[PDB]
Homo-oligomer: A and B are copies of this chain.
């Protein structure tokens, strides 16, 4: 067979990942421009939401040194790749869990619908990559919203998960924080209620 150059192998982000990707969190001075957890400016169009969650290890203990990266479409079902601190909305963001209580947060808008390669619409979702010490190669997952059951039931992606019970691990539960729309998304890396992780 045809063999291409091998891709550089992944390595754990390690415990100090914040020094490089979450300056504040590390408790270090940041720079003028930083990629953080606020994808939408209060005046961005769409239904503004607050996302939050915890990450648990195989023993049910909180993972407090995890780093997350998100990619989502804007309210029009559009990916805004030209990242700029001036935009009202950015498709990309970064978050990390607290060395205390250990909860991450993201301020964005609910994503519009995008079609898969075959032309079939996927349910509104947020793509997530999870990094942390002990994680050799980052984990891919998606966040779906419990208030979009109709769409979720027809997602070509959710529908690829053999077992219905596992599909549920990807659904964020709507709530409200200070009379603000919120969705909680807990990630269980291992064991009971273990979240669905993808390969693409």
Contacts and interface: CB of A to CB of B under 8 A. Distances in A.
Interface of A: 59, 61, 163, 165
Q: In the A-B complex, list the 4 residue pairs whose CB atoms are closest, starting with the nearest.
A: A61-B163, A59-B163, A61-B165, A59-B165
A197 to B, nearest CB: 15
Q: Is the interface of A mostly helix, strand, loop or mixed?
A: loop
The oligomer's copy count stands at: 4
Contacts of A165: 59, 61
4 contacts: A59-B163, A59-B165, A61-B163, A61-B165
A76 to B, nearest CB: 38
A79 B163 CA distance: 41
A171 B191 CA distance: 26
A184 to B, nearest CB: 23
Nearest to A164: B61
Contacts of A59: 163, 165
Nearest to A163: B61
A20 to B, nearest CB: 23
Nearest to A194: B59
A55 B163 CA distance: 15
Contacts of A163: 59, 61
